[PDB]
RNA sequence: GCGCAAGACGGACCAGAGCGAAAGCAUUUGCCAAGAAUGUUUUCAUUAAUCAAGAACGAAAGUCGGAGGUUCGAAGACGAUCAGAUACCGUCGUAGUUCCGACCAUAAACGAUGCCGACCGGCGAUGCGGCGGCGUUAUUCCCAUGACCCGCCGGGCAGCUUCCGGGAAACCAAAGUCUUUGGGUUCCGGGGGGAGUAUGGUUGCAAAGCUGAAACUUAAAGGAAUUUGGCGAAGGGCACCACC
RNA sequence: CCCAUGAACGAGGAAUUCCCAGUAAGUGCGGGUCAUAAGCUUGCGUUGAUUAAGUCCCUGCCCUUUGUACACACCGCCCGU
RNA sequence: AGGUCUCGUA
C-alpha cells in the first residue's frame with residue numbers, strides 16, 4: 009500500500025585517517041519520525057570489509073571490523089573494532105602432518121582497550137627432510153607458545169591502539185614471532201587470526217575527531 | 222526511491238546472504254552493516270510446491286525477482302556470502318545456491334567478494350537421531 | 358529366535374515365578 | 383572366519399577411540415573405522431564461473447575454495463559408491479587410488 | 484547479458500572418443516584459424532572429420548560431460 | 551544485525567602415533583603425587599615366576615538422596631507409508647543423558663590367543679633415551695644446543711617377503727623349537743538339546759550377580775575351502791529379435 | 795461379369811513392430827493350398843535414396859569379483875504365538 | 876626492426 013523507502017535517508021560512513029581509503033559505502037536509515045532519533049540507529053553497526061577495499065595495495069584475505077561511534081551529519085564516523093581472517097584461508101592453512109600451536113593473550117594497551125589476541129602456527133618440512141611427519145615435542149610446543157605470548161604482550165602494553173592498528177596492517181607481529189621461534193622449532197607463518205575488543209573506556213569525542221584527520 | 226549519488230560516479234555496495242539447504246533456498250539483501258534490509262525473496266514464495274522448494278528453477282526465479290527489486294531501488298554491486306544449514310548436520314550448500322548465484326549475477330548485477338559464513342561449530346551437541354542413525 | 362530375546366523372556370518368566378512365590382508362599 | 387588381518391580399523395594398541403557421527407547418516411561409529419573423505423571444491427564448477435569472471439567488480443581475482451571433510455559409515459560409504467568390494471588378495475593392497483584429474 | 488560476440492570459425496585438428504548416453508555426441512579439440520594459440524574442448528553433433536571448419540557462436544564454453 | 555543468560559562439549563591439527571594393569575584418556579595455565587624406557591665402573595645380595603583364602607579398580611545401561619535441566623532421546627501422544635505397523639519415517643515428548651555421594655559388578659570387557667624365561671631368517675619405517683659422523687639452518691667466525699640428513703644400541707604399538715617350522719585349512723616369527731612327545735606355574739573343554747533351567751547356599755532396598763544338576767529326547771550339531779544357485783551387490787562385453 | 799444405391803474415412807491416443815545397399819517401401823508375376831481357389835505363405839522380377847561407422851541410457855543375454863545357514867538348489871531354507 | 880614466441884592435450 010505504502011513504500012517505507014520514501015521515509016528513508018542515506019549516510020556515508022568514513023574510515024579513520026590511519027587507513028588509505030576513507031569511504032566504505034552508503035547506508036540507508038529511516039527518517040527521524042516521532043521522538044525516535046535516526047542517529048540512535050547508527051551507533052551499533054559493524055562492517056566486515058576486507059582490507060583490500062580499505063588500503064591501496066596489501067593482503068586481500070585479511071578483514072577488519074569497524075564500529076561507528078558518532079555521526080556529524082550525512083557522514084558517519086567509525087572506529088577499529090576487530091580483525092578476522094578469511095575462513096577459506098584458515099581452512100587451507102590447517103593441513104596434515106604438522107602441529108598447530110594456539111595461544112590467546114588478554115593484554116591491555118596503554119589506554120583501556122583490552123584485546124584478546126589469538127595466534128596460529130604450523131611446522132613444515134626441510135628441503136632435505138625425509139621424515140613425512142615432522143612433528144614437535146610437547147615441551148617445544150610449550151616453549152613456542154610462551155614465546156608467542158611474551159611477544160604479543162610486549163608489543164601491546166607499551167603503545168596505544170592508534171598506531172598498533174597500523175602495526176597490524178602488515179604481519180610485523182607475525183614476522184617477529186616467526187623470527188623469535190627459529191631456535192625451538194622452525195615455523196613458517198604466524199597469523200593473528202582473530203582480535204576481539206573486550207572492554208573500551210569512557211566514550212570520548214576528541215580522540216574520535218583526531219582519528220579522522 | 223533511487224540511489225543517493227550519481228549513476229556514473231561509483232557503484233553502490235550492499236551485502237547479500239544466500240542461505241541454501243537441501244529443502245529451501247534463502248536470498249536476502251541488506252545494507253553493509255547488515256541491520257536494515259531491502260527485500261527477502263525465497264524459493265518458498267515463487268513455486269507453490271514444497272517438494273519442489275529446493276530446485277534450480279525456484280532459486281533462479283527468486284534471484285531474478287530480488288535482483289529486479291534491487292535494480293529498482295538503486296543498489297548496483299553486491300558482496301555475496303554463502304551459507305549452508307550449518308549447526309551440526311551438514312556443511313554443503315543446497316542445490317539452490319549455484320543456480321541462485323548464476324541467476325542474480327546474470328541479471329546485470331556486479332559481484333564483489335565471496336565469503337563463507339556457514340556456522341561450523343568447534344564442537345556441538347549430539348546430532349539428531351539414534352545411535353544407529355537414520356535408516357530408510 | 359536369537360539368544361538375547363530368549364534370555365529376556367526367560368528372565369521375565371523367572372521374575373513372574375519369583376513374584377508369585379513371594380506373594381503366595 | 384576372520385577376513386582381514388586387522389579388525390577393519392587401525393586400532394592396534396589403544397582399545398578405545400573417539401566416536402564420531404556420519405555425514406550422510408546419523409550413525410555413531412568409531413573414528414579409525416569410519417571412512418574419512420577430504421574434498422577440495424570451488425564455489426562454482428562450470429556454469430557460473432564465466433558469469434562471476436567477466437561480470438565482476440574486481441579484475442585479476444581467484445575464485446574461493448570451499449573446504450569440508452566427510453565421514454562415512456561403511457553402509458553409507460558403499461551405498462554412495464565411495465568404496466567397492468575387491469578380491470581376497472586385492473584387499474591386501476593399501477595403495478591409494480590413482481589421482482590425475 | 485549485454486554481451487555480443489562475433490561468430491567464430493574454428494578448425495578441428497583432433498577428434499576424441501564419443502561421449503553421451505548413446506554416443507551421439509563427439510568431443511573434439513577446436514583450433515581458431517585466426518588465433519593459433521588456444522585448444523578448446525567442444526562437443527559437436529553429427530559426423531565430423533579431422534580438418535573440417537566449425538562455426539562457434541561463443542569461443543569460451545568448454546563442453547563438459549553428460550551433466 | 552547487536553548484546554544477555556544457561557547447560558553440554560573440546561572439530562579441523564588426529565596418524566594402523568602416545569600413555570595407563572584393564573575399563574579408559576585431548577582448550578591454555580598453576581599446584582600435588584606416581585611410572586615405563588634409556589645412561590651408570592653407585593647400592594643390598596637370591597630379596598625370584600605363577601597363584602586356593604582374601605583385596606582394589608571396573609565402559610553404558612540399572613537403583614537410592616540432593617543441584618541443574620541447553621541439546622538428543624526409552625515409555626507415551628499424534629500424521630502418513632501398509633491389506634494388516636502399537637515397525638522403517640516425521641512433530642512433541644516424562645524417566646535418563648550433567649555433577650556430588652550411596653550401591654550392582656555386567657559386554658563381541660576380542661588379539662574370540664594366561665603369565666615368566668631361553669632359542670631359531672631377512673628387510674625397511676615410526677615413538678623414547680643414549681652414541682658416532684659429512685654437510686645446511688637459528689644469516690656468513692668460534693663452541694653448546696634445537697631443526698635436517700647418514701648409521702648403531704634397548705625396550706614398545708605395528709608393517710612386508712619366504713618350502714625355519716606348524717596347522718584340517720583359513721593363517722601364524724609365533725598359533726614355532728610336539729610320537730625324534732618332559733623349562734616353571736594358574737583357570738578351564740569331554741557329542742547336540744534340556745540348561746545357565748529348577749533347586750540349596752550366598753551378596754544386593756530392588757533389578758539381578760556367583761556357585762549350579764537331574765529326569766526326558768536326538769545321530770547328528772559343528773570348523774576351513776573349491777566348482778554351478780541366487781541375490782531389491784559391484785564391475786565389464788555384445789546384439790537394429792536393444793537404443794540413439 | 796453388367797447396371798444402381800455412395801456410410802466411416804480430412805493422415806490417427808496410451809502403447810508398439812521391422813530395418814541400413816540395390817535396402818525398406820511402391821509395384822506386378824509364378825509354385826504350394828486348387829473340379830471352383832488368393833486378402834495366406836514361399837520365391838521371382840522392376841524403380842529406388844537420407845539415417846549412422848556409434849553406444850550400454852532403456853529392453854535382454856553372457857563372463858570376473860564378492861556373500862551365503864541354499865544342493866529337488868529362492869518354487870530354497872527357516873523363527874515364534 | 877618486427878607484432879598472436881616454441882611441442883603435446885579433463
Ligand SMILES: [Zn+2]
Nearest residue numbers: 404407455458
Ligand atoms: Zn552413515
